[PDB]
């Protein structure tokens, strides 16, 4: 009974390392993508400035 209970508790509480590592990598690439997008977007008011004159 203890072996089966430990197995069931692992199914519910213990983490899946493959899925979690995949999710972590996906989150990291998403963070870099948002970094690049934000860096590009921080330059539109520069285009506004170059028009003034």
């Amino acid at each position: 009974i203890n072996e089966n209970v430990n197995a069931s508790k692992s199914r519910i509480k213990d983490t899946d390392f493959a899925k979690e590592t995949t999710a972590l990598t996906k989150s990291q690439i998403l963070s870099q993508a948002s970094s690049s997008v934000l860096a590009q977007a921080k330059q539109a008011p520069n285009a506004a400035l170059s028009l003034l004159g």
Partner: protein
Amino acid sequence: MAVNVNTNVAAMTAQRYLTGATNAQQTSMERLSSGFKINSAKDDAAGLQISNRL
């Protein structure tokens, strides 16, 4: 045809195409940062419904 000071139709054309390009740029930036092609129903209504149900 004449050379005027009060109206600048070429300026209006440039402003219109500039706003169009800016809107396209903002849409592309939103899709790139979000990672989703459909971030509102105006992108694709049936696509949004299908993606939500899936």
